[model samples]
Target chain A: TVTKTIETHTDNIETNMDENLRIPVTAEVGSGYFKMTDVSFDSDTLGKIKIRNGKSDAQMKEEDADLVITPVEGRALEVTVGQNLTFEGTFKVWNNTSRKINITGMQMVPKINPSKAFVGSSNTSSFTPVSIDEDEVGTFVCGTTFGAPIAATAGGNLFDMYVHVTYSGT
Target chain B: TVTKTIETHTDNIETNMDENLRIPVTAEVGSGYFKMTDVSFDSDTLGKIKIRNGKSDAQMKEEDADLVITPVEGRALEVTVGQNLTFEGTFKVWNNTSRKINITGMQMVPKINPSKAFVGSSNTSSFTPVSIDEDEVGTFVCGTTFGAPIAATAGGNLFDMYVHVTYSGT
Candidate 1:
C-alpha cells in the first residue's frame, strides 16, 4: 500500500488580523446541502461564509438574513445599526485541528432598510456563541429561512440568509 | 423562471428512530475521536447509547482501549484529544433532523486474545469514559482513524485503537 503523506499545520496562532485582510460578512438562505458554490470564507476575515440556495435535488423555497460578526478578547465585537440587524457577542472558538463550531444565544440587534422591498421593513441581528472544529468540518443546514416572507428586497431578496463567523482561540 | 413547490416539515415527535432525524451531543475528547454507529435510546438507561462497534478502524493492531470522550454543554460539540493526535472524532451516521438528546458514551473493553497475536502474552481490560456535550450536537468525524504506540513485549510495536466517546447532561 502506498503510504499517504499527511500534511500537518501547526495550530494557527490567533494573532491580529492580517494587515491586508479585512473583516468580511456574507449571507445565505435555507439548507446548503445543494448549490454550495457561493458559500465560502471571507478573503480578509478568518471567518467562514455559507449560503445555501435551498435544496437543489427537490423543490424548496429560499430565505434570507444578513450576518455581521466580529471577534475580540475582553471586549465585545460591536456593530453599528445599519440596513439590517446584526448579531454580536463573544464565545470560545475551537482553534484546533478538528474543524467543528456553532454559535448560540448570541446578542442580536435590529437594523432596517427604509427603501428596500420585503414583507418586513425591519431586519434583525443577533450573536450566538459558537465553536468551530477543524477535522470535523460540519455543514449548517437551515430548515427555514430567517426572513421567510421578505425574500424580495434588500440583500437580493428571495430570502437572504447570512452567517458571520470570527476565529480566535488558544 | 420556474415555480417550484417549497417543502416544509413540522417538528416531529416520533418514538421510532427515523432516517431523516438529526440530534446534537456536546462533548469533549481526551485521547482520540470516538466512533459511533448503531445508535439507540434505552428509556430504562435514561441516556441514549450513542454508538457501538465490534472492531475499529485501527484494524486491531494492538489491544484496543475503551473509547475516550468528554461531555460539554452549550456552544459546540467537542472531539479530538491533543492537537497532535491524528484520529479525530466522527459522527457521520446521524440524520439531519434529530433532537439534542441525552447521550451515553460506550466503548469496547479490551479482552485478552488467547492467540497472543497482540501484546506477546497478555492483554489489558478496562473501560474508559467518553466525554459529554450539551445543547449543541456533539461534533465528531465518524470513521477517521489514528495511530498510537502500545506497551508490551514489542514496546512501540504494540498498541490498540478503538472508538472513544462520552455521555452527559441528565
Candidate 2:
C-alpha cells in the first residue's frame, strides 16, 4: 500500500515595467525528486503560458518529450483567477520527508531564452527556457521559474497563477 | 477602440528518433511579420509547449520558453512510442474577425537553440517556437522520421493535447 500526500499554493504577482525582463518564483518539494508522473492545475481566472516538458536528464530545454499537455477547465485541471485565485495539482509519491522551498531563481532568471525574446510598441515578453534539474523540487521559496512572465500595457488586466500539488508514495 | 490581429506559423516539422530517443523542436515569432502575443499548450495526456516573448525579427527554439508544463500522468497525452508528437493552438476571435490562418510546414526542428547547439548528444532533443494570430488556429500532430531509408514512424500514444487558450480583445 502507498500513502498519498497532497499540497498546493497561490500568489498574486505583478511585474514591473522592464524591457526583456525575467522574474523568478520558487517552491520546495520536501518529497523525493519529481518523477515523470501525474500532475494537474485549477484556477478561476484563465492565464496563458508556453512551457516545455518538466523532466529531463540533460538540459531540460534540450529534452525531447513527444506529448504536450494543456489543462482546459473540466477536461484537464481547472486553472482559475479573480479575487479568489488559486492553483491545485496532484502527483503520486513514495517517502516521508520535508524541507525548505523556493519558487524562483532559475538559471535563466535575468537570462532570457533568446529564442522567445519578442517585443513591440504594444507589448514586451520573453519565453526563454531556464536550465534546472529534471527532478527539480518546485520547493524553492522562489517557486521554480517554471513559467515566464506575461505582461501587457500599463493598465493590463491582472491574472493569477494557481497550482495544486498531490502526490502518492510507491 | 482600435483592434489589431496577427497570424504566423512554422514551416513543417520532420524528424527521426527511436523509442525514447531524444528529439528537437523549434519555430519563430518575430517583431516583423507575426508577433507572439501569447502561447499555451494542449495535450490529451500531457500539457503544452512553453513560448515566452519574442522580439527582433527572428526564429525561436523550444528552449526559449521559460516554463515547461508537462503532463500529470505517466503518459498523460499518450504519444507514439518512437515517433514525434506535434500540437497546435488556434487564434482568438476578438482581434482578427476575418483574418486568414497561416501554418508553416517543414520548419527546422533543432535539438536546442543555436546558442546551445554546440553541445552534441546532449542537444539531441529540443524544439522551436512559432507564432499564431491572436485569433488564429494551429493544430499539432505526432509523427516520426528516419534516416537512410527515410521512412517515418508514427502512431501509438493517445491524442490528448488540452487547449489552454488565453487572450484579450479590443
Candidate 3:
C-alpha cells in the first residue's frame, strides 16, 4: 500500500491596480473543501482614492476616501467554490483638517469606472463618535462578508476588490 | 542557483471583549505586500444580553436577545464597504412561563457604558413562528457586520456585543 499526504503552499506575488492572482491549490482525492486559511496585507498600503474624473487633490481627498488594508481578526474564509476574494477588516482615512469628521458610511468601486457591486448593506447603519482632530487620523472598523466565494479552480484563483470609506467633516 | 523562500508564522495570544489585536507582519521584500489570514472562533460561543437598568423578568427577557456565533451558511458577507454586519441565521429565546413569547427584532450594542453599534435592523423585523410555550426555548439566526475590522494588535481578541431582542407574548 502507498501513503500520501496533502499540504498547503504559499505564493508570493505582487499586484498592480485592477489585477488578479492565481492562488494555487491542490485538492485532496476525496475532499472537495478548500478554505482560505489566511490572507495578510501590509497595513500601511493605501488603495486608490477613487472619485470623479480628473478631480483635484483637494476634491479627491474631500469627496473620495482611501482604503487601508488590515487583517481580518476572525474567520479568514471557508470557500466551497471559486469567487472574488472579499475581506473582513478595518479601514482608516485621514480627516485632513481639524474640522470634526463624522464617518457617515463606506462604499466600493470595482475600478475608476462605473458599475456597482450587486450586494448592498442589509441595514443602513453608520458608525459614531468619529471626531478627528486637525491633521489627525480617525480609524473605523467594519465587519462584512463577501457574497461570493473564490472559484476553487484546479490552479486556484481569486481577484481583489477595492474598498472605500465615507465621512462628513466640517 | 537556488531560490530563497519565505514562510508565515502564527501568533498565540488572547484578547479582551471588543478589543483589537496587533497583527505582526514583515512586508515581502520587493512585493510590499503582507496579508494576515486565519481567524477562527469556537462556533458555539454566545454574546452577552444587554437591557435597561431595571425591568421585570418578562420585560427583560423579552427585550434582551442573546447571540450565538456560528458559520454563515451562505455568502458570509459582501455588502459594500462601510456597511454593517448583517446576520443570516436564526436565534432563540425561552418563554420560562406558562404563556408563549414571540420575538420581533434584535439590536446590537458593543459598549458597556453606552453607544450604538453601526449595524442595526429596520422596522423591527420579526423572527419566524417563535412562540415558545412554558419553559420552552426557541432559536433564530441573525446576520450582522461590524462596521470595522479587528484592530491588528496582538493576542486573541473576542468581543461580546450586547444584543437586545424585542418580543410580544401572551
Candidate 4:
C-alpha cells in the first residue's frame, strides 16, 4: 500500500491602494528532502490580482517599485493586483530520498461571485511527479495558490488566503 | 507506493450451429500464483443461447450425445444458441500458485434484444481461489466466455472477443 499526506497553510495580506503590488507569503516543509507538487486555494480577494514570477512591467515605472516589491520566491511566490483571474502553477524542485527539505510552487485563483467579474466554477493544476525510496524518512511539500482578494473599493482591504499541500510516497 | 496493472488479449472463433461447442481462448500471465477471477463481455449476438456446464437432456437427440459437458476444466467452455443472444461468463480457480498454470472458468450470457427468444440480462460467475508465492516467476492462463452469439441465420458467423487479466502482490 502507498501512504500519502497533505498539509495546509494560510497567508494574509491587504492592499494599500489601487496600485499593483506584490504580497509576500511563507510556506515550509518538515523533516526529509521535499519536492513540491500541487497547490490549492481558498480566499476572497485573490481573483482581483495577476500572479507572476516577477513584478509586472508597469510597476517598474518607478525605480523604487523594484525595491518596494522584493523577490517573493524565497518567502513564497508573488501575487499582484490586476485583472480578475486565478490559477495554479507547476513548481520545479530536485533532490532524492533522505533528510528534510522544503518545496514550493506558484498558484492563484480567480474569485467566483455573480457580483464580481467573469470567473469559472473550477480550476486546474498540473503536477510534476516525484519519486521517493521505500521507507525513506523525509518531508514533502505540495504547492501553493492564492484565494479571492478584497473588494477593490477600499484601500487597505484585508483578505486572508489558505493554501493546502498534499504529499504521497512509500 | 503500490502499483497495479491490467493487460488484455483477444481471441477469435467461428461456430457450428445446433451443437454444444467449446470456443477456444488463450490468456497468459507472467510470474506469481494464478487464479481465475472476473469476466466481462462486449458483443452483439451472445444472448440467443442457453449457456450451462452441461446440455439439457431433451436437447440431445443423437444416441452418442452424453448431454454432459464433462465440466470443461481444461477444454474451452461450451455455448448453445437457438435464437440470437450473447453474454460473457465468469470462471473460478483455486489453491495453486507459482510456475506455469492454465486458468479456466465457465462464462456465457443470454442476450437482451426484444427480437431474440428466451434470454436474460444478468448472470454472475463464482470462482475458486488459487495461491502462488512471491518471486516464484512463471506463467498463468485465464478462461473465457461468449457475450452473445450472432443470429443463426448464418452458420459460422465470426466475432472477436477480448480478455483482461489483473495481478496483485509485493
Clashes of each: 71, 137, 61, 51
DockQ, all candidates in order: 0.01, 0.01, 0.05, 0.01
Candidate 1 C-alpha lDDT tens digits along B1-170: 11121111112112211110122221123444333333444211122333333423232112222221222222123434454222233442221123433223322211122321222112222222222232232333232222232222322122222332212123
The reply for model 1, stretches above 4 Å from the true place, is A1-42, A47-130, A139-156, B1-170
In the range B1-170, model 3's lDDT, one tens digit per residue, is 11122121101000101111112221122221222222322201112323232233444455434421222223333333222223232334444433343443443322111221222222122234344555565554443344343231221112222222222333
Which 10 residues in a row give candidate 1 chain B its minimum summed lDDT?
A: B1-10
Docking class of 1: incorrect
Error of 1 at A27 (Å): 11
lDDT of 2 at A108: 17
Indicate the residue-level lDDT of A37 in model 4. 22
lDDT of 2 by residue, B130-165 (tens): 224433333322221211111112211112122222
Q: Worst 10-residue stretch by lDDT in candidate 1 chain A?
A: A1-10
lDDT for predicted candidate 4 compared with the true structure:
0.23
Worst 10 residues of 4 chain A by lDDT: A9-18
Q: Among these predicted structures, which one has the highest TM-score?
A: 3
Give the Å error, residue A147, model 2: 14
Show model 3 residue runs off by greater than 4 Å. Answer: A1-85, A88-90, A104-130, A150-170, B1-51, B56-170
Q: 1 or 3: which has the higher TM-score?
A: 3
The C-alpha local distance difference test score for the whole of candidate 3 amounts to: 0.29
| TM-score (chain A only) of candidate 4 | 0.22
